[PDB]
Amino acid sequence: MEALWLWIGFVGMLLGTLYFAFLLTNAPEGTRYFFVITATITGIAAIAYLVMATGSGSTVLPDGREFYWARYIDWVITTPLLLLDLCLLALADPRRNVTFIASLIALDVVMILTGLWAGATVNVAGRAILFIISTAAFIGVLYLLVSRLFAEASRRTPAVAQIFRTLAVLTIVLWICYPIVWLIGTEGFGAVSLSVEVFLFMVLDLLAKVGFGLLLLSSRQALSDIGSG
Numbered sequence: 001m002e003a004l005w006l007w008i009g010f011v012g013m014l015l016g017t018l019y020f021a022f023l024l025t026n027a028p029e030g031t032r033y034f035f036v037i038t039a040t041i042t043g044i045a046a047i048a049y050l051v052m053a054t055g056s057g058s059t060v061l062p063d064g065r066e067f068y069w070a071r072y073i074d075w076v077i078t079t080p081l082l083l084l085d086l087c088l089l090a091l092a093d094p095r096r097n098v099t100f101i102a103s104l105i106a107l108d109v110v111m112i113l114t115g116l117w118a119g120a121t122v123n124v125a126g127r128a129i130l131f132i133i134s135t136a137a138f139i140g141v142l143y144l145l146v147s148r149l150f151a152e153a154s155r156r157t158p159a160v161a162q163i164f165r166t167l168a169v170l171t172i173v174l175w176i177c178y179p180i181v182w183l184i185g186t187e188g189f190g191a192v193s194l195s196v197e198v199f200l201f202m203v204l205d206l207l208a209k210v211g212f213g214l215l216l217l218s219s220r221q222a223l224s225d226i227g228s229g
């Protein structure tokens with residue numbers, strides 16, 4: 001039954017990508033890169049979901065678990081881009097914040113890639129230590145987001161600060177759910193079926209990408225505030 005959720009994920013990301021590509025044509029000036037980044041987030045996710053939906057995004061591991069690894073290839077590209085969207089909202093001049101941005105992105109890539117490594121690992125003890133390492137990097141991401149970007153965004157215009165805060169809270173809430181789903185799904189304890197796991201990630205993905213992107217790209221006042229500068 002997981003095929004159903006993968007096809008819904010595909011169509012949802014596809015429709016989001018097409019809509020975001022459309023909104024670009026009326027983007028406030030100097031803001032078109034937001035629309036491009038956000039349509040790439042959903043577009044990459046659409047490709048991953050199509051791959052998994054057509055049966056090419058998973059392998060049966062030596063322990064017999066079916067492992068949807070294409071999921072993580074999506075994530076390793078799109079979660080940095082989501083953070084990038086948040087950085088470009090919050091930071092008035094990102095060219096002077098290379099060290100922070102590279103640090104945030106590197107932590108995020110370590111999180112995803114160590115989670116993929118944990119998921120692919122059959123040895124139960126190696127899987128646990130790798131999940132902890134991944135969660136450690138995740139805490140790094142949340143910390144940089146909360147300690148640095150919330151402060152930066154408070155110096156932006158009221159509309160920019162408002163959409164940043166909305167997207168950042170949305171991000172923190174949704175991203176915390178992903179390790180929980182991992183832990184109850186087949187990669188972790190197997191408390192729920194693979195079909196349930198795939199459904200949960202599909203709902204999270206659509207909210208964290210299409211919901212995120214709808215809120216971002218509809219905030220035309222905030223965008224124009226940034227574009228005008």
Ligand SMILES: CCCCCCCC/C=C/CCCCCCCCOC(=O)[C@H](O)CO
Pocket residue numbers: 121123125126127129130
């Ligand atoms: C300036 C940057 C500094 C960064 C410092 C990082 C320090 C943290 C690293 C710790 C090493 C952890 C090794 C054990 C986990 C890997 C098991 C792997 O297990 C497996 O792959 C399977 O169990 C094999 O069957």
Ligand SMILES: CCCCCCCC/C=C\CCCCCCCCOC(=O)[C@H](O)CO
Pocket residue numbers: 014017043044046047050
């Ligand atoms: C919005 C970002 C992009 C998201 C993806 C949307 C575009 C999807 C494009 C094509 C779908 C059909 C693919 C056919 C491939 C044929 C290769 C060879 O095929 C075959 O071998 C035959 O199936 C025979 O079995």
Ligand SMILES: *C/C=C(C)/C=C/C=C(C)/C=C/C1=C(C)CCCC1(C)C
Pocket residue numbers: 075078079111112114115116118131134135138175176178179182205208209
């Ligand atoms: C569009 C996709 C998104 C926003 C995916 C987010 C994924 C995560 C925040 C993943 C977190 C993980 C851990 C913190 C521990 C190991 C397992 C992961 C990779 C699910």
